[PDB]
């Protein structure tokens, strides 16, 4: 169960979507979402095929190849590049070139958190944060344990999906062995079975046995 219109798993990671921007109106978020393909050219290799397709169905209805991270789907969409919306960009987004392949798996789950911790500091919430990803200069070699390392005593960016609020946000953290207590971070992290994005549920108040 993968179905990659036209092969891969690369595409265009979002990064940042501006508000009543097109990419808004769209329904594109941030950090779940990859641009696979619009208007039936797929974005598959690293180019201004995007920027090239945006700028020449400029006020016009364009669809658009979403797969999310998040539920592990495809979707389409429809957008209306613009210069009419306000803001800077035909779609006003950020966005990057790279691979999806086990972007789900790339989560970690925020537990406990110490008061006074770098973790606290930073504002990670107990239980409903999740680290979702980082943002490095040269786009490298992930891995939050190895980011926490590489980065001790350094300002770092996080992205955390939030269950409360269902969404996404950027988080600095400054990791910080010499904080007074154990780790770097100062709160519980679990990692794996049921430490991944959560999935909906439907059906609410449905009645459980237990």
């Not at 290799?45 to 090239?52: A, E, P, Q």
């Not at 972007?103 to 504002?123: D, F, I, K, R, T």
């Not at 154990?182 to 108040?205: D, Q, V």
């Amino acid at each position: 169960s993968v179905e990659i219109p036209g092969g891969g798993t690369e595409g265009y990671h979002v990064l940042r979507v501006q508000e009543n921007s097109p990419g808004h109106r769209a329904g594109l978020e941030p950090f779940f979402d990859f641009i696979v393909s619009i208007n039936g050219s797929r974005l598959n290799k690293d180019n201004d095929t995007l920027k090239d397709l945006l700028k020449a169905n400029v006020e016009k209805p364009v669809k658009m190849l979403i797969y999310s991270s998040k539920t592990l789907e495809l979707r389409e969409a429809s957008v209306t590049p613009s210069n009419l919306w306000g803001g800077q960009g035909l779609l006003g987004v950020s966005i990057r070139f790279c691979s999806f392949d086990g972007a789900n798996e790339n989560v970690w789950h925020v537990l406990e958190v110490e008061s006074n911790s770098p973790a606290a500091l930073a504002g990670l919430r107990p239980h409903s944060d999740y680290i979702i990803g980082a943002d490095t200069v040269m786009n490298e070699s992930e891995d939050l344990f190895s980011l926490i390392e590489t980065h001790e005593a350094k300002p770092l960016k996080l992205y955390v999906y939030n269950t409360d609020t269902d969404n996404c946000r950027e988080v600095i953290i400054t990791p910080n062995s010499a904080w007074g207590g154990e780790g770097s971070l100062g709160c519980g992290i679990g990692y794996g079975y049921l430490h991944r994005i959560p999935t909906r549920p439907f059906e609410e108040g449905k009645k459980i046995s237990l």
